[PDB]
Design a protein around this ligand. Structure first.
Ligand SMILES: COc1ccc([C@H](N)c2ccccc2)cc1
Ligand SMILES: COc1ccc([C@H](N)c2ccccc2)cc1
Lengths: 265, 264
């Protein structure tokens, strides 16, 4: 992978692996989510980071995802090359936004796109912080000044409020626990694991007869290594819509809320 | 990746990803197991397999792993390039063997090696079958004629019998269930998930202070999508462990294995 000529975005090609595909021999949305995470990490490395700034490392501050929104038109098949372009942007004092564009390497056609919202958080106290002006200047040199949105639209599906699923849920998957493969290099549960846990409560018939078009996921609380999660889903709706909720198996503490959109095959 | 000049083995380079590494910023043994599986698939595709041959498809026959043995000396760090070479061999009518050699792309040094034993099984009846003529001839053209072993040592760790763990186990991780990410393209639980489940019962103190050197795993029964597994471990001893995976309910054995860990 490499930064584009202007140094304001990063591109990388990925060959889809045998273990990265589902029943239709195309990449799973969890594989896509891993690739977006990987290309975002390589963008930070290529711009002199390791993705906290000098001031953030000093103040015990980290970036935490608040929302992830993925829209897929064509899932890359096993053996195909997918090119992903990613860039960052400052959204005032609220936080930062990272956008992604997925393309077919043989045709050059846009096969997918993603957007994510990141807020600052003190590593230790877990308290959210607004972006300090000094921190803003430290990464404005790596972001385009003019707005560049993967989801430009006037009232797009990436910026819409998600309601809370009410009991009883239509479907559920109970007793979900992360294993060591679900942890990242800092022993935190990987953001991609939450996507997989959300999709666990969608019935296998819907997964076998439909394809995932859109997924919007809000991160509320972090699942610990020793926590147990319940995944709940209710059909809200040729297309199918679902309302999702991840919560602690015990006290019902909310960890995630989301929505999925599926098109009939 | 590409076949070597003689067409009797396959090589592929892999750049280690951020999500593929553990706490020491080096690849997990599950990441290595996935890469060996990936390089074995690309070897089959490059030699004309769209690896169930043409005769096996007519007979509803598939290759199933009976044993996987991995020995790692140096785990590739995040961002490093690891080159893996893989080849196949016939072992008479018992089945086939696939070996792997892992190398550092910058130094050319051997950082790991693996071996696996595969037996034939009827897809439908689940009955094991000895390898017959026509089938042997079909893939003998892709295997070296002279013996080429990743573990040449006469009577080595990869060809040793594994005992059954007796109750009570020293450590345990119960209620393990596979999710859709644990399934392969044919909806079966992939062989790498079993490695992860075995390691779940090793205490976090051993994982934080030791490095995994050897893992030998025997596959006895397949875990279904709706099955629940219990992972059991006992220290037999460097540190040595005896492992057992079994159905949470009736205690049906699905796997047995051994791990060897070196102090950091
Ligand atoms: C804005 O969204 C988030 C904010 C903070 C968290 C954080 N991991 C957490 C852990 C434990 C308890 C509460 C918060 C996660 C998401
Ligand atoms: C010699 O090693 C094996 C033999 C057979 C199996 C197979 N998956 C299985 C599934 C269900 C019931 C019995 C066998 C796996 C390994």
């Amino acid at each position: 992978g490499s930064l584009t000529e202007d140094g304001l975005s990063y591109k990388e090609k990925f060959v889809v692996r045998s273990y990265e595909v589902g029943s239709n021999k195309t990449a799973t949305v969890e594989t896509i989510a891993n690739l977006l995470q990987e290309v975002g990490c390589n963008h930070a490395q290529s711009v002199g980071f390791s993705a906290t700034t000098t001031t953030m490392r000093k103040l015990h501050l980290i970036w935490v995802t608040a929302r992830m929104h993925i829209e897929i038109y064509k899932y890359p098949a096993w053996g195909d090359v997918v090119e992903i372009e990613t860039w960052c942007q400052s959204e005032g004092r609220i936080g930062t936004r990272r956008d992604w564009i997925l393309k077919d390497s043989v045709t050059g056609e846009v096969t997918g796109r993603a957007t994510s919202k990141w807020v600052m958080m003190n590593q230790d106290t877990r308290r959210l912080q607004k972006v300090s002006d000094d921190v803003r200047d430290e990464y404005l040199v790596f972001c385009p000044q003019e707005p560049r949105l993967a989801f430009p639209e006037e009232n797009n599906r990436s910026l819409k409020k998600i309601p809370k699923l009410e009991d009883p849920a239509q479907y559920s998957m109970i007793g979900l626990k992360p294993r060591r493969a679900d942890l990242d290099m800092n022993q935190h549960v990987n953001n991609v694991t939450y996507i997989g846990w959300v999709l666990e409560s969608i019935p296998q018939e819907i997964v076998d007869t439909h394809e995932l078009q859109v997924i919007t996921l809000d991160y509320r609380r972090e699942c610990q290594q020793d926590d147990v999660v319940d995944s709940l889903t209710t059909t809200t709706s040729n297309d199918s819509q679902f309302l999702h909720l991840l919560r602690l198996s015990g006290d019902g503490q909310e960890i995630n809320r989301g929505t999925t959109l599926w098109r009939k095959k």
